[PDB]
């Protein structure tokens, strides 16, 4: 998985 | 906006 | 909060 | 792997 | 806080 | 923004 | 390896 | 896993 | 604090 | 920002 | 090796 | 593992 805050 | 990927 | 399983 | 965020 | 499983 | 990768 | 952040 | 604060 | 498993 | 890698 | 930071 | 403070 991944996450980009903005 | 934020981006979530799984 | 958030959760990505994979 | 899984990802948890709070 | 956060957690990355791998 | 921050970036998380697993 | 896993990653924990607080 | 990895983390970029900004 | 933080922890890197590997 | 800081960078963590495992 | 593992890395702990406080 | 590695850590870059900034």
From Swiss-Prot, chains A, B, C, D, E, F, G, H, I, J, K, L:
Illness = PrP is found in high quantity in the brain of humans and animals infected with neurodegenerative diseases known as transmissible spongiform encephalopathies or prion diseases, like: Creutzfeldt-Jakob disease (CJD), fatal familial insomnia (FFI), Gerstmann-Straussler disease (GSD), Huntington disease-like type 1 (HDL1) and kuru in humans; scrapie in sheep and goat; bovine spongiform encephalopathy (BSE) in cattle; transmissible mink encephalopathy (TME); chronic wasting disease (CWD) of mule deer and elk; feline spongiform encephalopathy (FSE) in cats and exotic ungulate encephalopathy (EUE) in nyala and greater kudu.
What is the protein's name according to its record?
Answer: Major prion protein
Top-level division of the source organism's lineage: Eukaryota
- Compartments (UniProt record): Cell membrane; Golgi apparatus
Please name the source species: Homo sapiens (Human)
The residues of the intact protein that this chain contains are 127 to 132 of 253
Free-text comment on this protein's domains from its UniProt entry: The normal, monomeric form, PRPN(C), has a mainly alpha-helical structure. Misfolding of this form produces a disease-associated, protease-resistant form, PRPN (Sc), accompanied by a large increase of the beta-sheet content and formation of amyloid fibrils. These fibrils consist of a cross-beta spine, formed by a steric zipper of superposed beta-strands. Disease mutations may favor intermolecular contacts via short beta strands, and may thereby trigger oligomerization.
For this chain, the Swiss-Prot or TrEMBL PTM comment says: The glycosylation pattern (the amount of mono-, di- and non-glycosylated forms or glycoforms) seems to differ in normal and CJD prion.
Q: How does it assemble?
A: Monomer and homodimer. Has a tendency to aggregate into amyloid fibrils containing a cross-beta spine, formed by a steric zipper of superposed beta-strands. Soluble oligomers may represent an intermediate stage on the path to fibril formation. Copper binding may promote oligomerization. Interacts with GRB2, APP, ERI3/PRNPIP and SYN1. Mislocalized cytosolically exposed PrP interacts with MGRN1; this interaction alters MGRN1 subcellular location and causes lysosomal enlargement. Interacts with KIAA1191. Interacts with ADGRG6.
Q: Which family does it belong to?
A: Belongs to the prion family.
What this chain does, per the entry, is described as: Its primary physiological function is unclear. May play a role in neuronal development and synaptic plasticity. May be required for neuronal myelin sheath maintenance. May promote myelin homeostasis through acting as an agonist for ADGRG6 receptor. May play a role in iron uptake and iron homeostasis. Soluble oligomers are toxic to cultured neuroblastoma cells and induce apoptosis (in vitro). Association with GPC1 (via its heparan sulfate chains) targets PRNP to lipid rafts. Also provides Cu(2+) or Zn(2+) for the ascorbate-mediated GPC1 deaminase degradation of its heparan sulfate side chains.
What else the UniProt entry mentions is: This protein is produced by a bicistronic gene which also produces the alternative prion protein/AltPrP (AC F7VJQ1) from an overlapping reading frame. The alternative prion protein/AltPrP (AC F7VJQ1) and PRNP have no apparent direct functional relation since a mutation that removes the start codon of the AltPrP has no apparent effect on the biology of PRNP. In mouse and hamster, the alternative initiation AUG codon is absent and is replaced by a GUG codon.
